[PDB]
Amino acid sequence: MTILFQLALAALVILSFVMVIGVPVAYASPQDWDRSKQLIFLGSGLWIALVLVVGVLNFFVV
Amino acid sequence: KLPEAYAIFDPLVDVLPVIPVLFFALAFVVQAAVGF
Amino acid sequence: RIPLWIVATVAGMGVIVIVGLFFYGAYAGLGSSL
């Protein structure tokens, strides 16, 4: 599963570069703090997972 | 020397640490947007 | 009308970025140690 791996973290890559941009605005912007506050748990579920995905995945390198 | 499968990544991690300087450096970007 | 703030961040990169080229050219330039 060498292949499908690269994308498992290259997933937690674009997720967090996005989480970095999102989360903030959600506590500062008036543009509804609750819809954004909920989509917040979105990546924070993939985050916990996506890494754990690279998790047991990491052992299957070369 | 980044464990094989991650070689594709040294390109980034190579600029990873140099973040921290940016952070005090950031708390400044904002403050001007707020005119102090 | 450009945000007086952004006038200061875009530029504060001009030096921050040019001095960065400068600092590189000291590791391969004509003034390198090689």
């Binding site: 970095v20 | 970007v29 947007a33 | -």
Partner: peptide
């Protein structure tokens, strides 16, 4: 060849998180 792209991206990221936050207006 040059990740000089990555650093500038990461850069422009947070100094423009404020832009959007100032153009959307949001008690900064």
């Amino acid at each position: 060849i040059a990740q000089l792209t990555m650093i500038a991206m990461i850069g422009i990221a947070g100094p423009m998180i404020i832009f959007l936050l100032a153009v959307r207006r949001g008690n900064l």
